[PDB]
Amino acid sequence: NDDDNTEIIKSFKNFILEFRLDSQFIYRDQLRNNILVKNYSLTVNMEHLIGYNEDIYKKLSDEPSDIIPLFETAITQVAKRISILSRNSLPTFQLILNSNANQIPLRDLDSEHVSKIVRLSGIIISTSVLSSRATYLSIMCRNCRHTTSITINNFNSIVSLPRSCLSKNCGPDPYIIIHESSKFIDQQFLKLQEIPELVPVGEMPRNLTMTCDRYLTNKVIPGTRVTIVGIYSIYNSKNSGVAIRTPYIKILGIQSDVETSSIWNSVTMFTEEEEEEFLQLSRNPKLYEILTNSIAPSIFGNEDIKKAIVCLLMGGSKKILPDGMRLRGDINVLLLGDPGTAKSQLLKFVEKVSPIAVYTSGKGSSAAGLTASVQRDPMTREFYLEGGAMVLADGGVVCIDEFDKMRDEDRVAIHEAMEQQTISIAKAGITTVLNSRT
Amino acid sequence: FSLTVLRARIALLATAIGGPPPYKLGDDCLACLKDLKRWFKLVDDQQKRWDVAMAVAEYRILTDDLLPILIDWENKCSLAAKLANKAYYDKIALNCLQLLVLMTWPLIVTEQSSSNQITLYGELKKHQLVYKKTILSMESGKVLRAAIRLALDVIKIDRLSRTPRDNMVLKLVLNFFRNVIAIEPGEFTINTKKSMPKKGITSIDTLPPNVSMDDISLNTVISSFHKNKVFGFLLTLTSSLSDFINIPLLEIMFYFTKDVNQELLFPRTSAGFELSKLLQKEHQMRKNVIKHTSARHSRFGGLLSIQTPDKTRLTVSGSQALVDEKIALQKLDDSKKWNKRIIKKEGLPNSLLNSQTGKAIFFTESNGKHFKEFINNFIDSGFNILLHSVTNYFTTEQDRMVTLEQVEYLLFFAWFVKYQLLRSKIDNSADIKQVSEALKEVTFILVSSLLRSAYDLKNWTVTHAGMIAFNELLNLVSRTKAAQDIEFIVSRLFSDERIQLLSNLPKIGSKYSLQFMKSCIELTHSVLKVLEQYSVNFQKVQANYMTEPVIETYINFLERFRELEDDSIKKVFSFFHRVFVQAKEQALLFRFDLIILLREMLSPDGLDRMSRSRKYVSQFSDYFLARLKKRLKKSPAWFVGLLFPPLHNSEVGFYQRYGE
Amino acid sequence: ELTLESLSNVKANSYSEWITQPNVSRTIARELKSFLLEYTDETGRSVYGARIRTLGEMNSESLEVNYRHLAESKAILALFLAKCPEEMLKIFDLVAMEATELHYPDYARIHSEIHVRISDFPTIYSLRELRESNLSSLVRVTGVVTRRTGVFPQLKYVKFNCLKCGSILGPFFQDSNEEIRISFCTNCKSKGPFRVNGEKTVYRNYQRVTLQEAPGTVPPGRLPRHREVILLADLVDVSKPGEEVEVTGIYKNNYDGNLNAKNGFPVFATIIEANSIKRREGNTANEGEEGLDVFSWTEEEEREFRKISRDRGIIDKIISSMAPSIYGHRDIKTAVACSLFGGVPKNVNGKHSIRGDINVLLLGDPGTAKSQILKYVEKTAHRAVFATGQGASAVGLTASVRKDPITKEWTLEGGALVLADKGVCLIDEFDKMNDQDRTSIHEAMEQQSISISKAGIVTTLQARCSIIAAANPNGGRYNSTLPLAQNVSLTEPILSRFDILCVVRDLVDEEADERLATFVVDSHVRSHPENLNARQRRLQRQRKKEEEISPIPQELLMKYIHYARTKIYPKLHQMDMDKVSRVYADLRRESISTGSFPITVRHLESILRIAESFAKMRLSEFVSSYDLDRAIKVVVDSFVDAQKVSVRRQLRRSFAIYTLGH
DNA sequence: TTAGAGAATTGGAGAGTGTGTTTTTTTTTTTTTTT
DNA sequence: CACACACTCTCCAATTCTCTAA
Ligand SMILES: Nc1ncnc2c1ncn2[C@@H]1O[C@H](COP(=O)(O)OP(=O)(O)OP(O)(O)=S)[C@@H](O)[C@H]1O
Ligand SMILES: Nc1ncnc2c1ncn2[C@@H]1O[C@H](COP(=O)(O)OP(=O)(O)O)[C@@H](O)[C@H]1O
Ligand SMILES: [Mg+2]
Ligand SMILES: [Mg+2]
Ligand SMILES: [Zn+2]
Ligand SMILES: [Zn+2]
């Protein structure tokens, strides 16, 4: 198997080195620029890989979990070649794929597509804390102190410590991990829920466990709509039929539309051309009319409400005085009036145009579900918080339709989160003051 | 691949013969019957596979197809026999019955047999029981009425006008009767290639779900025989004895009586009286059982110390021991978990060759009444004639007789000659001349020669087949002497040549089955009573009987008091009782084995208190203890010599065994 | 070469053993292939040829084989299937694959295997009447789905690799009920750990739904029994939780040590391996029908739909055939028909969304067949849910969250408006529900989406329902001298949602009373239970009774409605927007002055939605001028008839110029 | 036939491979239907 | 993880056996 693995590695190495569209080696330049800013990855488009040599794409799409580690090895070798002067300690690079294949609905992922590469869309509803998966596992024999090493690829087939002293018997399991010499990478578990417009008739939305890795972690926040290029894989969690297997997707590329954690990662990730476009737009003498006319274009009239919605979307300016007290910079708008005046349509449009938005109805909404819900962990028996509508919509706008139908004891919970913009919780031994700048 | 092709052919033949809902004979029915016969014959002996029979049983051919052929032919035969292509409609049943007897042939497995036969024996013995189960329950089992047609067609013509070919038809049809009734459950051949675990065999029931012990017992066979009129067939076949219809018939009417006792014939709400008596007996034994159990729970914690000699403080638990010191000593005895090794050991139709005394097949009262008269009618018809028919054949081919012939002949002879004498004893309506014809000199010398020849070849089963007849020889000699020179020629040849054979078997057969030991005690009891009316010397024949191994083999029978009956204990105890004053040889009786059995006898846990066995035994043991005390008080060394075996030294042999 | 007659004469003692015989298996396969290729019904067309054509056309993977057809011809095969389905289903699956390959060569590329869904099993049981005699035999239990696990891939052909010596183990078939046992390896007798091979392995879908005895069939006051049901590939996600279904499948049993330990007896655990599923929720009055889908139409049925739709006056026939056994009430029947067909749900550029379902409110005096019309609509509509008055809470109408008793976390389960998604929801006694329960359907009736943000579950379900509610005026009698708002306790926000508001009045007219009494007595005589074999003679009698009152048969009307709903989307290209604008302006002007019915823009869109429903009735793909004038007439009539009697004549005279022609 | 020299087999202690635990649903939130 | 249990793998001297002993 060494010869075939080396041939695959060399082929994808030549793909990295030789591919160019018009006078510019796209992937050589991208790899060097990524290395310069300590971004040990390579975002490889799939049309380019198909166009270069379709046999490589066929091999990749046949058995992705066995070929992708070889492609990561090829990327690492090219990185050493083009960023290290011959005559190391460079991490195994991560391959991030970009595809334009037809999106498979999240409910259509069935027995087939197992171990295949699937591209699908959904909305993230949960993001786990970062775990630690080992890659370099320095290991030492318990009895004879035979220190060796193990390298992990993290692409589960469908590895463990050796069950041998591997160089008196030393027992069946003579290996203990040396934790001061191992090298780890961070891994995050997501949870994808299908698009509300794609669920079948009379069906609840379906979740799907997902795993990020290295540079694809801390990339999305709950509530964001994403399209994922991943491997629909299988793992047998020990947690009720016979020979059943819990399915999950191993992410190889995430393409959100609302930026990364924070907004634009708490900073500006705007390409220079689009930043110049925004600057050109801001100088338009009729920018106010352009923005007003583009808020729910199908709603006739209601010019003043559209202007107020524009002001709400932009928001004020937050101030933090030296003495400590802060002044909120968010605008709250209430729309009273007769039925049939397109208030709910305006709310639904604002839920679309705003980068971060949550649409909730007043009737079906509770106080602990609007701000923060104290929940008991089924495994560890420990209480923890789960964010509500006013935490998911943090940094954005929450649209509370049918406001007057809220129970009197549920509408009160919004009082602090609207003005002070903090949610205070003292329940089950928890005492925190979260933030809701909505 | 060969096996599944064989299964395909069997299924192909199954759908070719035809079916129901009247059964229909398909096209080329005779051709397919001949093909099946040829295939089965080829795989039976020429190839020795025993796989075609398996496929036939699987398709339930014998039940679904073969039996309806004979059933449908029965009505046509009755119509043709009562009205006043008959040859074609007659020859069709011939092949069917030939197939039936071939499948019903008993299977024998030996060392020379290959692995396939022994492997499939356990899988085909159950199907063997299935055949007889479905045959007997098939609307009163009328297939035997069709079978007897396959014999009356040939026997109808004159015997001198017999056929050199049709003669085999009689053998083939006659073998079916003995084959169906010899079907018995086999043995679970445990795979002893490795040590067995801490648990034994789970189930010893070798019966498929369709087969129940109710529907396969010999009671069912006898009821089917009575309801199918075949009693008249068996009587008329014997009524015309005046060759080939003797050897099969020797076991055709013997299999159902090979192990059935004659005691059940006479009783000596009717069934409920014995039920009440058995409830009383089991209530008595359960009452004896609870005498050891504590009045309170086990965890009451009754602890005690026995101040045994040497001021020992041995601790034994149990509040029961606080009642009696003997109970404490018994709890001391059985507390040890260590045990020694006890050594231990049918190739022919099971019977006395392997049946304990309590294996009395349950019989319906009407069925018992019918069987009481059936065998009596057979005796009144052709018993001695049948014996004399095979006397000539028995005188020839002495070394050419397979071991099956002896076990199927001697047991028959002994059982029937015993039945005739017991029936004459209970009721005087039967003359002794009805069995006195067996006292022929040539028959007696030939059976004695066979008995003596079986000794040197270590054929213990064949020899046990001979003692059961030898007992009745002496019994009939006594009966014809008391109720009366013809008896002298039969009962004078055991002077010197035969004394060794009769006096050696008790000394050696004690290491074998219970019935082998039971035969010799009856032999000695009979021989000690036949000669009592003429005394060659009474004091000389008993001299060779008073030997230590003989006492050992007599006392080894007494250890089974949990199953010994009144007569079994009576004979063993009377052997010693009759020599108490007549022989005066009690010195050889001084082993601890007899004393411990006496302790067991008088204890309530042994013999019944309400019965008529423990009273005279208790009185005789009271005298035994007086004799023991008198003999032990006069010799201090005899206190410990009572345990050790006797000595071969000259002076002590008369000093201790006779007291000077 | 065995004939059908041999198949009936079992040779192997056991049936399963009889079926497993290669000759019997070949004979059965040949007979089943002949049945599939050559079975023809009364009308003469080959049923299963068309079924296989449709199967391949949509890559269905499942062949719906009626059990009555299998029983009528080659009844021995039907008996075998009903007695030992485990092997008969395999044989008949192979036969179905062969037939499909005959119609569609090289179909193995699309789907490797074709499953057979047996339908219309005669002997229907309940989860209480199952016994040990039904083990390993086809059953047709009926119950309501309670739980439903996710669709977990399951091992189909396990190919283990020996760890000690070997590297390949036989492709054992997983039975979906018990774990595959390896025991001693073939390469060496020594035992050790084993694990599967990821090289050559195929998976199948697996879902374990938990049937529970339906509250309708449970004896009153008794606890309901329940059995777990295994849904294998192509059957997953076909039964939503809370729905009522009829499950045909093998009733197998597997040994588990937990149950034996708990009960202390060598007792086994039973389970149903589903072979087909038919949902009976919302069509509980539809007994006597055949097939796994009452609303599925054959090609001939579609041709008949297209033939009758071209008729002039098909709309009138459809309207007159809504409540055939209910006299009069043509306005109510028109409104119900419009609601049943529904409108087209628009979506402008993906931003603006317009409701496409029509809501109807039946308000009137008692004993005017308002609840009976609702029961009929429940019988007819595809997905219908019935909820009444106080017996329908706020969260049971839309959606509720619960703490899962097994996994102990909050999960969201739908209510009436979700179980009736893309269907109809029927609310009897609308005015008697609690206000805080009635206000819970405001969003799902206009936005058609339920928004839940409780217990940390922030999500927006989809409920494209069409509410049909029967109300009752204040005091029990509709006072014609008062406006509509003074006769009901409902407010404007809930009154504006209903597109058509039909006011029913119970007046005393001797001619009307005579005609109604005659109709009711005739209907009571007709429906009397005491009023060429049994099946088609009974069907002929049913058709004879139906043709008296309903111009179009009901069993065909249901399929017609479903076909129009799922395959027609009329467009409003050719229209006179000036007429609709003028009608809307007049409606608002007369609403503000001398009126109380709220006329918002929703009542402008109601005209378009009703016009689209009328265009659907003719199966047309474009809304004609007649279909718009009829919608305008319906809306203005519903507006006018709800006004006080003082101003009704003036309003009718004012609006007469728009309904010119009728 | 007896006291005594030779073959022949297999059960009872022990080397060893793999097990089996401890191991938990209280109290506290959040929902929901009745009250 | 390790101490205790259940049990497969494995093994010589006391217990049985039959050829040559007295
Ligand atoms: N000015 C308008 N322009 C376009 N469409 C409108 C306008 N006013 C109303 N509509 C339509 O009328 C309907 C109004 O329904 P909604 O806006 O969802 O309910 P609402 O206006 O919030 O009144 P409520 O919620 O019952 S108080 C939608 O179909 C709108 O598209
Ligand atoms: N127009 C009608 N034609 C036939 N039957 C009618 C009509 N109106 C009422 N009925 C009969 O009245 C009975 C009761 O109707 P019901 O369902 O109580 O109406 P509501 O609930 O509005 O009072 C029904 O059995 C129905 O047959
Ligand atoms: Mg609204
Ligand atoms: Mg009503
Ligand atoms: Zn080591
Ligand atoms: Zn192996």
Author numbering:
A (entry chain 5): 20 to 106, 130 to 200, 205 to 213, 234 to 305, 319 to 517
B (entry chain K): 15 to 34, 43 to 106, 117 to 274, 280 to 305, 329 to 405, 412 to 550, 556 to 606, 657 to 781
C (entry chain 2): 180 to 710, 738 to 868
The authors write:
The replisome that replicates the eukaryotic genome consists of at least three engines: the Cdc45-MCM-GINS (CMG) helicase that separates duplex DNA at the replication fork and two DNA polymerases, one on each strand, that replicate the unwound DNA. Here, we determined a series of cryo-electron microscopy structures of a yeast replisome comprising CMG, leading-strand polymerase Polε and three accessory factors on a forked DNA. In these structures, Polε engages or disengages with the motor domains of the CMG by occupying two alternative positions, which closely correlate with the rotational movement of the single-stranded DNA around the MCM pore. During this process, the polymerase remains stably coupled to the helicase using Psf1 as a hinge.
To test this hypothesis, we performed a rigorous 3D classification focused on the C tier of the MCM ring of all replisome particles. This analysis identified six conformational states of the replisome, referred to as States I-VI, which vary in both Polε stability (Conformers I-IV) and the location of leading-strand DNA lining the MCM pore. In this replisome structure, the CMG helicase serves as a core to assemble Tof1-Csm3 onto the NTD face of the MCM ring at the Mcm6/4/7 side and the Ctf4 homotrimer onto the interface of Cdc45 and GINS while Polε associates with both GINS and the CTD face of the MCM ring at the Mcm2/5/3 side. Parental duplex DNA protruding from the NTD tier of the MCM ring is captured by Tof1-Csm3 and bent toward the Mcm6/4/7 side, resembling previously reported structures of the yeast CMG bound with Tof1-Csm3 and the in vitro assembled human replisome. In Conformer I (equivalent to States I and II) with a stable Polε, the MCM ring adopts a compact inter-CTD interface of Mcm2:5. In particular, a stable attachment of the leading-strand DNA to the CTD interface of Mcm2:5 is crucial for modulating the MCM ring into a conformation competent for Polε to dock. In State I, nucleotide binding can be found in five ATPase centers, except for Mcm4:7. It is noteworthy that three of them (Mcm6:2, Mcm2:5 and Mcm5:3) formed by DNA-engaging subunits are almost identical in a compact configuration with nucleotide bound. The electron densities corresponding to the bound nucleotides indicate that Mcm2:5 is bound to ATPγS while Mcm6:2 and Mcm5:3 are bound to ADP. The remaining three ATPase centers (Mcm7:3, Mcm4:7 and Mcm6:4) are less compact with the elements for ATP hydrolysis (sensor 2, sensor 3 and arginine finger) shifted away from the nucleotide-binding motifs (walker A and walker B) in comparison to Mcm2:5. Furthermore, Mcm7:3 and Mcm6:4 are bound to ATPγS, but Mcm4:7 does not show any nucleotide binding.
